[PDB]
Ligand binder design. Structure first.
Ligand SMILES: CCCCCCCCCCCCCCCCCC(=O)OC[C@H](COP(=O)([O-])OCC(O)COP(=O)([O-])OC[C@@H](COC(=O)CCCCCCCCCCCCCCCCC)OC(=O)CCCCCCCCCCCCCCCCC)OC(=O)CCCCCCCCCCCCCCCCC
Ligand SMILES: CCCCCCCCCCCCCCCCCC(=O)OC[C@H](COP(=O)([O-])OCC(O)COP(=O)([O-])OC[C@@H](COC(=O)CCCCCCCCCCCCCCCCC)OC(=O)CCCCCCCCCCCCCCCCC)OC(=O)CCCCCCCCCCCCCCCCC
Ligand SMILES: CCCCCCCCCCCCCCCCCC(=O)OC[C@H](COP(=O)([O-])OCC(O)COP(=O)([O-])OC[C@@H](COC(=O)CCCCCCCCCCCCCCCCC)OC(=O)CCCCCCCCCCCCCCCCC)OC(=O)CCCCCCCCCCCCCCCCC
Ligand code: HEA
Ligand code: HEA
Ligand SMILES: CCCCCCCC/C=C\CCCCCCCC(=O)OC[C@H](COP(=O)(O)OCCN)OC(=O)CCCCCCC/C=C\CCCCCCCC
Ligand SMILES: CCCCCCCC/C=C\CCCCCCCC(=O)OC[C@H](COP(=O)(O)OCCN)OC(=O)CCCCCCC/C=C\CCCCCCCC
Ligand SMILES: CCCCCCCC/C=C\CCCCCCCC(=O)OC[C@H](COP(=O)(O)OCCN)OC(=O)CCCCCCC/C=C\CCCCCCCC
Ligand SMILES: CCCCCCCC/C=C\CCCCCCCC(=O)OC[C@H](COP(=O)(O)OCCN)OC(=O)CCCCCCC/C=C\CCCCCCCC
Ligand SMILES: [O-][O-]
Ligand SMILES: [Cu+2]
Ligand SMILES: [K+]
Ligand SMILES: [Zn+2]
Lengths: 62, 65, 61, 52, 230, 226, 60, 459, 107
């Protein structure tokens, strides 16, 4: 974690460069419509992780 | 930036487009209409008139108008 | 590890730390505005019709 | 690092903006409808909203 | 030198969540309401992600702020139950002499009190491991078994009860108080399904919140058991 | 400080994978031209090279020893700046209580900008009055209108920059004799032999000077999977 | 004395209602082309691109 | 952006803006009521559309209380200055602050939409069952609005409570005023939610709490257990403002700061235990009536201490300073007006006097003098004091003696006659009345039209 | 209760027989609505507003010290109208006590 328990990542192993990660000027043209759909789906990984852990117990109740 | 120092800088520096003010007043005007229009509609629905004539629910003299 | 290369923490709001992914989620929901307006307007029409408020004039004609 | 001049001379010579003209109490009654039906940015935003 | 607080300047979840709420009202189908609830869950989870990402600010007061919010919320949960207990006792003078069958004081109360106590013991072990920077995999699945049995027992009770909500305000209060407890039990499932070991350990507000909430729900059942069953 | 959160792992030491791979240029870079990571590893490599050479320590002066470890010999200029820096940081999450301010000794109000909001509560006991807030701008000796308490603004400003530990170290510390890579190699062979590495930082550092992958086991150390 | 007369010269009475010409006579909605004013509209107000469409807080 | 903004000061402006907008609808409803009551007969509402009048009075009350004065005095001024008074950069919970104002707007849209689409019937703003539970769907919509409003109120209360954790200066009296209102909300709202859910259960879930063998008086207990704390949740922020204005404009340090603070705390505790003075005529037990009457009269003690501490703030102030500023006039007018409202409150507090004066226009005038005059003027005075900080313009209010005089005179023309008809007696929540009560009703109606005209002169 | 600072008679004794109370005007001046120039753009009108702040004004006494614009509450300390970010540097509330430590002094 980038918190007290851990620290920063060495530059040798950084893969998300903020200069390229940000600067979203005209990003929709770079990704296209299918890319836009992919990015939206990928933005909800946190919500997907939850639903994978929440659904099973509810199936059992049903 | 100097332009971003003040919140609502255009309005505070007196450069804002007047349309913003017009919309605010229009929104208030529409809010007021929510008390008058249903009054007229309901009056007509149950009576057939948009507004009553003062004391038309009571006995009136022959020459009353 | 270099402390000065993490300025995106305060330069960018947390809601958009995800770059295009976070911008895409906002943009997708933005596309649903007018569909929502039509849907909400339909509900008003549904209640207005079911209460016979369209026959205000036909009732007394 | 960007270099900018102290001032720039515009190509046109039209003084489009300035202080408000003196207005009366009911000036809005004609100015507001004028903007709606005569300013493009206003009536293109209205038609767009209504259509969709 | 840095600013004391890393201000959040913009947020769009609030609009979405508020619109989602309106859909509950402005709808013509109950299926739309079911799917709308999923949208709510998703966006509430995004807000939780924002809270986790605020950890990057290294602000000491963040833990305290969130902890005290939970205190206020727990207080509101306790006061809602109080309002139901109030509704129950206001009509106490019309109970126990009506031609209805009230609940037994032997079977349901005992197995439920024994069950909910075991739930507390599991959560307590989770807290103990949290203190000891340790984890035991089986613990969460014991909670799932406990929740399953609780759901199985409550469903059968309602279906086999011979008195209905319209029979008496006693029956209405019994069903409503039990349902309110169940809803808070289900909210505990919502919270506990994500329990995992996080290496930042005791600066994680989730752990303290779960412990407090589970204890609240179990304690609330002690009060209910005395009022209704015993 | 009480307002700071918990020490990170990095607050103690940095991972050896953050060592710059061009050690030869790192040890020749002037201090003013070294970044935070570069400055960390310059001091650690040079400081541990001198500390891991016991036979030379007794003959090394404290001035030279402090330079090798990267510690700044203190003086009144630097002490003043560092002290006012730490006083500013402390006041970020602590109360502001001290002696009554007079013309001879005004209340010192540290600031980075040209202004800081300040409140006067008066003296002690019955001489304490309600908070009177005022904007303390630089270049004026302020006097409370109620108790006549004198205030003054102190600015942490130096040459188009504010005062930081990095700025104080750059302005007052002077680079000594250029670090000799022969010392790195000599100490490396002292503590690293026959598959025993008792100076891990000097084994990695010597490997980079050799070109990366030269020393035994270093290719395997640098081969990662993700 | 009348203090308004001292600074009467600075206050030149206005010509346009609300201080803007009809958009047809001059399009104040467009971004200014002047160098160093890409974040401003022609009338001087901040452009929607600078504040909304490509706000820096959103990663632009 | 506009809707996405989290700035606490921007959100404070939004609260004031929305209160004025929704306020237009509130005032319009008030004009309808007073027009109708101008004489006996039907004037603007047909006898076959009397249900509309019942809806007008219901919505008037609900909107002015929960959508106008509460969002203005507890949401508007608080969100703008509280973080500044606390010498903190911004509000503790930025994202929660944004959603709260959006929630208020969404609940307002639901209410007004229900006017347009649903059948128009009314049951009072106190939604007494069984009348509330035998109505049409408009009652269901209003319940949704209240519950949604409750969410915004509670989360905003949580937001203000967190200032104690971050405040970097001294807790001024005004900050104490908001904190205590927040506490009052945290303790009262959960009870309201419960009783509202029971109203829904009887409306929508075939529950039987408000049918025979179920006590309808139960609702009144739980409702008013929130009801009266609400009237102090609406007045305490006004008291906090009055303290700041008097001290600042008179250049005088608050006298008895700790007594002011301890008076606010006292009012809250007492206000949480006196609710049944709204239920005097139901037929409660003699000892209960005596308890509530006794404790209700006690509230005057702490409330009286604050009034006298304000008076000495204005006494002795320098004569050279111009005293005609609108903010100062409004602050002074509040003391003069609040005493009238409070004294009449003590009169109605005596239950035997209350038997004659319950459900009469004397009660109306009582709470109007405090809210429609006192609270409104306090909000105006507070905004006026912060005109430079807020930065609004295009109005002629800051120095307008005509507006203050005309407002004071005409507002009293409306509600002073309503005290008289309380001993006539003219019941509340009625539209038709006997011909011998026209004079006073007519005078008040002339006052209402006049006040509206004075609202146009500010622009 | 607060009744002003305590005065000892020795402190009321003048060093000259002609000393009287200094007659310095504490009226800051004549003001009105801030008047922006038409020529100034949004940035330059912001600078104009920042230069018209009354809370940045003071009165200089005969000995060169200045009594600033003061207020009971910090609401009057931010720029008018309030900027988006006000108290970047935490405002310092100065408390006074009689405690001292030796490290602060030198002999
Ligand atoms: C109680 C009353 C009296 C009070 C007295 C006492 C008052 C004391 C003082 C109080 C002061 C409080 C603090 C003030 C702080 C002000 C801060 C400020 O100015 O902020 C800046 C803020 C914004 O300025 P900015 O920063 O430049 O913003 C730039 C924009 O963001 C970006 O610019 P843009 O141009 O890109 O903007 C986008 C624009 C784009 O706009 C356009 O394109 C507009 C085009 C023209 C449209 C015009 C309207 C058309 C309507 C047609 C209707 C047709 C009806 C046909 C009927 C037929 C019947 C047969 O808008 C939109 O796209 C969305 C607009 C949405 C809002 C408007 C909604 C209107 C109502 C809608 C109702 C719908 C009902 C549906 C029902 C459905 C049922 C099924 O200012 C405002 O918003 C204006 C505020 C103005 C008032 C300020 C206060 C002044 C002092 C008080 C005066 C008295 C007021 C009394 C109340 C009103 C009475 C009516
Ligand atoms: C989440 C599951 C909830 C199940 C509730 C069921 C309630 C009924 C009674 C169950 C009694 C067993 C214990 C339940 C409590 C939890 C145990 C526990 O913590 O295990 C941790 C243990 C290891 O956990 P860990 O996180 O790796 O280590 C935690 C500790 O650090 C290290 O842990 P440790 O080594 O200290 O162990 C703690 C100790 C504490 O427990 C005790 O000592 C309690 C003793 C109770 C005695 C009651 C008499 O527990 C054990 O020793 C558990 C041994 C389980 C061995 C299971 C091996 C596979 C069995 C496959 C059976 C397949 C049958 C097919 C039939 C087909 C017919 C056609 O977990 C497991 O091994 C997983 C299974 C857990 C027990 C499941 C019991 C299911 C019973 C099904 C009966 C079906 C009968 C069918 C009859 C059909 C006739 C025709
Ligand atoms: C087959 C089907 C299968 C299943 C499918 C299931 C699908 C599930 C979908 C689930 C999701 C659906 C919902 C998606 C929501 C997405 C939200 C989002 O992410 O948006 C990002 C998006 C960001 O936009 P962007 O793409 O970056 O660019 C935006 C533009 O550049 C503009 O830039 P801006 O944002 O700076 O400009 C905004 C602002 C610009 O400002 C102005 O227009 C001028 C300045 C203000 C003028 C004065 C206004 C009055 C004073 C208000 C004071 C309080 C304000 C509080 C704050 C605002 C609250 C809205 O004006 C406005 O747009 C609204 C202004 C306030 C309007 C209300 C004022 C009161 C009127 C009262 C009238 C009646 C009495 O958000 C927005 O900007 C728009 C959000 C719109 C949300 C609308 C919700 C309305 C709910 C109404 C009630 C509903 C029930 C009844 C309806 C009845 C209808 C007949
Ligand atoms: C903010 C609004 C507000 C405020 C402050 C108050 C304050 C008080 N109210 Fe309230 N009241 C309402 C709003 C308010 N009320 C509303 C809206 C209703 C009707 C709701 C409905 O029925 O639908 C209502 C109804 C209401 C009733 C119901 C009458 C009836 O139903 O028939 C009663 C009676 O007990 C009452 C009493 C009081 C008292 C005793 C105070 C006290 O707080 C007053 C205290 C102040 C003073 C006493 C004056 C100042 C003090 C002094 C000058 C000291 C010297 C004075 C003495 C020693 C007495 N109120
Ligand atoms: C605070 C809430 C509030 C306010 C301001 C008002 C204001 C007014 N009310 Fe009030 N009224 C109630 C709350 C309020 N009322 C309640 C709760 C009831 C009982 C409901 C019921 O019986 O069920 C009631 C009942 C009520 C009735 C009784 C109808 C009946 O039940 O028979 C009547 C008419 O006689 C009336 C008239 C008026 C008038 C003429 C005004 C005002 O118009 C007088 C003139 C004053 C103004 C026009 C200024 C108001 C301005 C603002 C509110 C905006 C402020 C915003 C900012 C400062 C930003 N009111
Ligand atoms: C006649 C009734 C009152 C009309 C009224 O005052 O409306 C004012 C209001 C705001 O106008 P200004 O204050 O001039 O703002 C523009 C920038 N100065 O005007 C409007 O909204 C015009 C349209 C009104 C329609 C009413 C129906
Ligand atoms: C060892 C643990 C002890 C716990 C004791 C807790 C005490 C809390 C008391 C709070 C309220 C006290 C009010 C004064 C006592 C009055 C009791 C009383 O009169 O009860 C009956 C009377 C109703 O009767 P009537 O309206 O006259 O007619 C009804 C016809 N169907 O009052 C009630 O409704 C009582 C309602 C309150 C009960 C719940 C109190 C809060 C519970 C908190 C639980 C945690
Ligand atoms: C409900 C809203 C509660 C808001 C107040 C408490 C928020 C809280 O503590 O959440 C954080 C807390 C732990 O996060 P940390 O990273 O440790 O702390 C955040 C930064 N210090 O998160 C949780 O409690 C986990 C939530 C997971 C389940 C979410 C389920 C949502 C269900 C919505 C149903 C509708
Ligand atoms: C604020 C938190 C503390 C509130 C305490 C309020 C208690 C007030 C005591 C009032 C009193 O004497 O109660 C009588 C009164 C009922 O009187 P009658 O209907 O005449 O019935 C009496 C015999 N049939 O009691 C009640 O209504 C009590 C209501 C329960 C309050 C519970 C509050 C819970 C707070 C958490
Ligand atoms: O209500 O007082
Ligand atoms: Cu009351
Ligand atoms: K009438
Ligand atoms: Zn002082």
């Amino acid at each position: 974690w980038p918190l007290w328990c851990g620290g920063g990542v060495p530059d040798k192993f950084i893969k998300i460069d903020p200069d390229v990660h940000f600067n979203l000027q005209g990003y929709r043209e770079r990704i296209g419509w299918y890319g836009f759909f992919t990015a939206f789906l990928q933005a909800n990984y946190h919500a997907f992780v939850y639903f994978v852990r929440f659904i099973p117990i509810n199936i059992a109740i049903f | 930036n100097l332009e971003d120092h003040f919140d609502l800088a255009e309005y505070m520096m007196k450069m804002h487009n007047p349309m913003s003010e017009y919309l605010y007043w229009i929104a208030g005007f529409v809010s007021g209409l929510h008390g008058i229009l249903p009054l007229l509609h309901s009056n007509y629905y149950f009576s057939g008139m948009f507004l009553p004539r003062d004391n038309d629910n009571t006995q009136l003299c022959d020459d009353s108008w | 590890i270099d402390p000065t290369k993490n300025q995106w923490r305060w330069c960018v709001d947390p809601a958009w730390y995800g770059g295009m992914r976070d911008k895409a989620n906002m943009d997708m929901y933005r596309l649903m505005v007018y569909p929502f307006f039509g849907y909400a307007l339909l509900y008003l029409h549904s209640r207005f019709k079911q209460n016979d408020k369209y026959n205000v004039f036909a009732k007394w004609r | 690092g960007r270099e900018l001049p102290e001032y720039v001379v515009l190509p046109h010579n039209q003084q489009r903006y300035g202080r408000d003209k003196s207005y009366s109490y009911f000036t809005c009654l004609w100015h507001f409808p004028k903007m709606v039906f005569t300013e493009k940015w206003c009536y293109t935003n209205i038609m767009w909203f209504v259509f969709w | 030198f840095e600013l004391n607080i890393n201000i959040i300047n913009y947020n769009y979840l609030g609009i979405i969540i508020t619109v989602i709420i309106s859909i509950y009202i402005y709808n013509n189908s109950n299926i739309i309401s079911v799917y709308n609830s999923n949208l709510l869950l998703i966006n509430i989870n995004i807000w939780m992600k924002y809270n986790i990402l605020d950890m990057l600010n290294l602000n000491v007061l963040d833990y305290k702020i969130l902890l005290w919010i939970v205190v206020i919320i727990i207080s509101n949960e306790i006061l809602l139950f109080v309002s139901f207990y109030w509704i129950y006792y206001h009509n106490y003078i019309n109970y126990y002499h009506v031609n209805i069958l009230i609940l037994n004081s032997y079977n349901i109360v005992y197995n439920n009190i024994i069950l909910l106590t075991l739930l507390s013991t599991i959560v307590n072990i989770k807290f103990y491991n949290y203190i000891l920077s340790y984890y035991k995999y089986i613990l969460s699945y014991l909670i799932y078994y406990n929740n399953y049995m609780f759901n199985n027992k409550i469903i059968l009770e309602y279906k086999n009860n011979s008195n209905y909500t319209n029979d008496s305000v006693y029956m209405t209060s019994y069903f409503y108080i039990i349902l309110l407890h169940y809803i808070h039990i289900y909210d505990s499932i919502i919270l506990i399904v994500v329990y995992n070991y996080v290496n930042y350990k005791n600066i994680n507000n989730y752990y303290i919140n779960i412990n407090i909430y589970y204890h609240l729900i179990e304690v609330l059942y002690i009060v209910i058991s005395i009022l209704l069953y015993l | 400080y009480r307002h700071w959160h918990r020490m990170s792992e990095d607050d103690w030491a940095l991972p050896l994978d953050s060592m710059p791979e061009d050690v030869k240029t790192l040890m020749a870079t002037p201090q003013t031209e070294r970044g935070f990571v570069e400055d960390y590893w310059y001091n650690r490599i040079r400081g541990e090279a001198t500390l891991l050479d016991p036979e030379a320590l007794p003959s090394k002066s404290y001035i030279a020893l402090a330079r090798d470890m990267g510690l700044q010999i203190v003086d009144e200029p630097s002490s003043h700046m560092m002290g006012l820096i730490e006083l500013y940081e402390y006041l970020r999450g602590a109360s502001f209580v001290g002696p009554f301010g007079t013309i001879e000794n005004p209340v010192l109000v540290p600031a980075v900008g040209q202004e800081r909001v300040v409140a006067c509560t008066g003296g002690v006991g019955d001489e304490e009055h309600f908070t009177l807030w005022f904007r303390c701008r630089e270049g004026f000796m302020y006097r409370c209108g109620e108790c006549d308490q004198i205030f003054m603004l102190v600015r942490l400003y130096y040459e188009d920059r504010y005062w930081t530990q990095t700025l104080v170290r750059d302005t007052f510390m002077s680079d000594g004799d250029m670090f000799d890579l022969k010392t790195l190699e000599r100490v490396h062979k002292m503590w690293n032999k026959d598959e025993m590495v008792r100076w891990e930082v000097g084994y990695w550092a010597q490997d980079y000077v050799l070109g990366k992958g030269v020393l035994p086991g270093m290719v395997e150390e640098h081969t990662r999977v993700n | 004395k009348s203090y308004y007369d001292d600074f009467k010269d600075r206050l030149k009475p206005g010509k346009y209602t609300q201080g803007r010409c009809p958009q047809s006579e001059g399009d104040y909605r467009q971004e200014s082309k002047t160098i160093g004013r890409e974040h401003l509209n022609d009338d001087g107000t901040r452009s929607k691109r600078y504040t909304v469409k490509e706000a820096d807080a959103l990663g632009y | 952006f506009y809707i996405l903004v989290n700035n606490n000061k921007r959100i404070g402006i939004y609260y004031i803006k929305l209160s004025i907008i929704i306020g237009i609808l509130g005032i319009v409803l008030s004009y309808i009521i007073r027009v109708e009551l101008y004489n006996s007969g039907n004037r603007i509402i047909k006898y076959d559309n009397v249900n509309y009048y019942n809806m007008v009075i219901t919505l008037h009350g609900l909107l002015m209380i929960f959508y106008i004065i509460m969002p203005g005095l507890y949401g508007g001024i608080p969100l703008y200055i509280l973080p500044i008074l606390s010498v903190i950069t911004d509000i503790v919970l930025p994202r929660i602050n944004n959603i709260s104002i959006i929630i208020v707007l969404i609940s307002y849209i639901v209410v007004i939409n229900s006017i347009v689409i649903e059948y128009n019937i009314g049951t009072g703003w106190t939604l007494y069952p069984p009348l509330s539970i035998i109505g049409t769907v408009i009652v269901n919509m209003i319940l949704y609005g209240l519950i949604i409003i409750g969410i915004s109120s509670i989360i905003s209360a949580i937001n203000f409570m967190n200032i104690l954790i971050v405040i970097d200066g001294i807790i001024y009296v005004y900050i104490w005023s908001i904190i205590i209102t927040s506490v009052l909300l945290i303790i009262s709202l959960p009870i309201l939610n419960g009783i509202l859910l029971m109203i829904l259960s009887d409306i929508y879930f075939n529950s039987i709490y408000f049918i025979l063998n179920g006590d309808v008086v139960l609702y009144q207990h739980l409702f008013w257990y929130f009801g009266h704390p609400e009237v102090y949740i609406l007045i305490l922020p006004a008291f906090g403002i009055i303290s700041i204005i008097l001290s600042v404009l008179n250049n005088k340090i608050i006298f008895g700061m700790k007594s002011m603070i301890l008076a606010i705390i006292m009012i809250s505790i007492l206000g949480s235990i006196v609710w049944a003075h709204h239920i005097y005529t139901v037929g409660l037990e003699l000892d209960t009536k005596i308890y509530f009457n006794n404790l209700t009269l006690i509230i005057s003690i702490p409330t009286g201490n604050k009034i006298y501490n304000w008076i000495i703030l204005y006494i002795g102030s320098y004569n050279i300073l111009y005293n005609g500023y609108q903010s100062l006039i409004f602050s002074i007018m509040f003391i003069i007006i609040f005493i009238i409202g409070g004294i009449t409150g003590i009169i109605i507090s005596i239950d035997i006097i209350d038997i004659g004066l319950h459900d009469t226009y004397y009660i109306v005038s009582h709470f109007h003098y405090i809210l429609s005059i006192g609270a409104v003027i306090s909000l105006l005075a507070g905004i006026l004091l912060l005109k430079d900080i807020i930065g609004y313009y295009n109005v002629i209010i800051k120095i307008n003696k005509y507006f203050g005089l005309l407002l004071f005179i005409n507002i009293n023309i409306i509600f002073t006659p309503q005290f008289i008809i309380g001993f006539n007696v003219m019941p509340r929540r009625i539209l038709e009345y006997s011909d011998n009560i026209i004079v006073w009703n007519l005078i008040s109606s002339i006052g209402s039209i006049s006040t509206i005209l004075i609202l146009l002169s500010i622009f | 209760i607060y009744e002003g600072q305590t005065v000892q008679e020795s402190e009321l004794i003048p060093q000259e027989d002609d000393w009287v109370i200094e007659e310095t005007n504490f009226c800051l001046g004549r003001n009105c609505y801030v008047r922006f120039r038409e020529e100034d753009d949004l940035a330059r009108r912001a600078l104009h507003q920042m230069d018209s702040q009354l809370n940045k004004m003071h009165t200089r006494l005969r000995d060169g010290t200045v009594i600033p614009y003061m207020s009971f509450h910090p609401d009057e300390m931010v720029d008018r109208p309030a900027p988006i970010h006000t108290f970047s540097e935490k405002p310092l509330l100065k408390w006074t006590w009689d405690e001292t430590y030796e490290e602060a002094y030198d002999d």
